[PDB]
């Protein structure tokens, strides 16, 4: 029988007004004998009709993958509305329903602190710039780095870790050529979260 | 005080007929106070004649497209300095620091253009089975309380139709 | 039919000579009608016989859980020897075999850097003490905190994140009262890893 | 230079007959140079007579258990100052900063004692179905190149047999 997986929109798509967030209802293990799948979408119980079906895709393991995409409103998602996807197919005894929405709990603003590289690390060829983002809720977030308005791609960010106060925290590490650091270059840690003013905040770091 | 808007996007997208693609504009808005504001993300499209060596964008004119020199641009056929029809507009109302841009979405309009569409809950434009008819100079302008707070341009076209766009600015 | 899961020893048990590391072969879904399970252990192909069977445990979901424990030598594990557990039972058409051993790859010494709280943090109730442990391989590690020889339990450590150079890094955050930090108190980050001299190193943090 | 050994463990373990438990000694060794060394983790057991008010450990004697005053302790029946049989010994050879203690494990010996055993690849002692016969004063001594680098004591016994152990030390 087919299986269903309901995915939430990307954090950046929900936090930026210049983007379009969407919920994705993926149906796997669709058979060749019965590939026709019906979708019924609901938002807080109220059925909606603006969803679109992505083009069918052959998986080569004897099944198809049928997907439905529903566009959501930034404020609807952020306000904790529930999205339900009902999937019906002749090889399914009864319709399958999955529900997903934002994590419930009072949103808390993340505290962002930039931390310079340890003096002990200067003996190495490249150094580590840290950015501590803590006290945030929910875990949906986006953290990036930049310098002179240009994006710095040489970083790794830990997954959110649940703190002892019910909030989340994480650490992001940008690695730069020691020369760049010692020269006074200014680097910034950009964080996007719903509880921040205008969903954004930027914290700089330099020698 | 007020609102700050910053836009980021490549200046050109070269496409071959039949391809499907979308723009990749990035827009961030920061409300410095708790005042309520309205926002409009507007897309303008300009014809780029074959005989034009390059397109000229009259920057100062974007802010007052009704001035004589802007309504009748000196570089006439190759100038982006005023407009009538708006290709597309996504509007926001009742926006604030606490009810930020995505959440304050209100209306969306788009001219009937074969193969053109909004990529759902996004300010980017999507082109399906692109054809030469889609080539031209596109401008994305962001208004806050009916005043431009940010703008950018993208020349979207096939290689043969492409003409460099130049921003004519004050000293 | 029964299922098998083979677990490696704890990092601290392999790194401390005062402890005894062991591999655990767990067999779940053992049936009430045929709970007799035979174990055959191998170390690099050579069959060994010093394993012990843990007392049988009723799961209350119609099945038993049968477990076998094999004690290993610190050096044998650290040297990358392979441990295979073969599980035979009447309800099993053919014996099930699982193999586990240390992660293969040249071991690299972790660099440990302690990072003090941000100036911006000096106005909150509690401050954050950071410890950056990077450049290590394999990911098997143990990180703890202490002050005046006494263990500080108020910390959270991110899981190891794979860096762009094939090594791992992580961050540990200890949260303390501004008073303590202000007073000049000495806090430490204890790290245990096979690649460290004596599998140990401490990094102090104070003013 | 040389090696530093630090030991940590509670000073007492009270048990009731029939219980199964083990010691929880922690030992860390730090080699400050690349010199090769040998190590021996030795467990000593001392009888604690019922008539003793307390046991006395002659610390200085641990380093020279063959001196007259150590072989014939003044507190005679209630003194831990010398030994003959060693309850258990885990030996290490060819150890170094790069071939650290666990990896340099070589031999292990333990006296035949009902219910006593090594908890596999560990320096701790395990007592199964503990009985009054197991009560006594235990010392864990760590030697590096045949010289004591660390030591600790644990009075392991039932409540009725327990006697406080006191370390007699120099000024
Ligand atoms: C036949 O083949 C099928 C296709 O598989 C192909 O790949 C390999 C498997 C090959 O071996 C070969 O078979 C095929 O070429 C195969 O389907 C798979 O079936 C799995 C089990 O049935 C299923 O597992 C679940 O996976 C969930 C996670 O899925 C995501 O992550 C995986 C891996 O990273 C990825 O492959 C999926 O595509 C999913 O990826 C996410 O997709 C969403 C939706 O598009 C993205 O979100 C949107 O992104 C857009 C982008 O523009 C927008 O941003 C929009 O706003 C977003 O909404 C999202 O970004 C993307 N994430 C990632 C990381 O890529 C698990 O959640 C799930 O586990 C949960 O549930 C189970 C059961 O309840 C529990 O056990 C778990 O504990 C957990 O609770 C589960 O693991 C695979 O996902 C599925 N693969 C695909 C590609 O669909 C099928 O089984 C085969 N059948 C046979 C008989 O062989
Ligand atoms: C009948 O009931 C059985 C019991 O159910 C009840 O227990 C709960 C846990 C729930 O299961 C709940 O429903 C019930 O109340 C049930 O058994 C379960 O069956 C699962 C599927 O068959 C099986 O899943 C696998 O789990 C692996 C991880 O297991 C560990 O972690 C979980 C929790 O994170 C824990 O519950 C387990 O006990 C395991 O814990 C580890 O245990 C080892 C050995 O004791 C520890 O290592 C030793 O520790 C000692 C000290 O204790 C020494 O230090 C020694 O040196 C060490 O070696 C270890 O510390 C400990 N770790 C943790 C974190 O606790 C997954 O790895 C595994 O995933 C793989 O395979 C799946 C496919 O199966 C893939 O999808 C994955 O991608 C991956 O490849 C898998 O998920 C459960 O483990 C099992 N639970 C138990 C307790 O046995 C049974 O299925 C039920 N059957 C029916 C028909 O209903």
Residue numbers in the entry:
A (entry chain A), C (entry chain B): 237 to 443
B (entry chain F), D (entry chain E): 220 to 390
Give the text the authors published on this PDB structure.
Herpes simplex virus type-1 expresses a heterodimeric Fc receptor, gE-gI, on the surfaces of virions and infected cells that binds the Fc region of host immunoglobulin G and is implicated in the cell-to-cell spread of virus. gE-gI binds immunoglobulin G at the basic pH of the cell surface and releases it at the acidic pH of lysosomes, consistent with a role in facilitating the degradation of antiviral antibodies. HSV-1 gE-gI is a heterodimer composed of two type I membrane glycoproteins: gE, a 530-residue protein including a ˜401-residue extracellular region followed by a predicted single transmembrane helix and a ˜106-residue C-terminal cytoplasmic tail; and gI, a 370-residue protein including a ˜248-residue extracellular portion followed by a predicted single transmembrane helix, and a ˜94-residue C-terminal cytoplasmic tail. Here we report the structures of CgE, an Fc-binding fragment of the HSV-1 Fc receptor gE-gI, and a gE-gI complex with Fc.
Crystals of gE-gI bound to Fc were large, easily reproduced, and had an ideal morphology, but diffracted weakly to ˜5-Å resolution. We used experimental phasing methods to independently corroborate the molecular replacement model. The binding mode observed for Fc and the CgE portion of gE-gI in the gE-gI/Fc crystal structure was verified by an independent theoretical prediction of the CgE interaction with Fc. The locations of NgE and gI in the gE-gI/Fc complex can be approximated by an analysis of heavy-atom and SeMet sites that are not accounted for by the CgE and Fc models. In addition, the orientation of the gE-gI/IgG complex on a membrane, as predicted from the complex crystal structure, demonstrates that antibody bipolar bridging can occur on the surface of an infected cell or virus. The gE-gI/Fc model is consistent with previous observations regarding the characteristics of Fc binding by gE-gI.
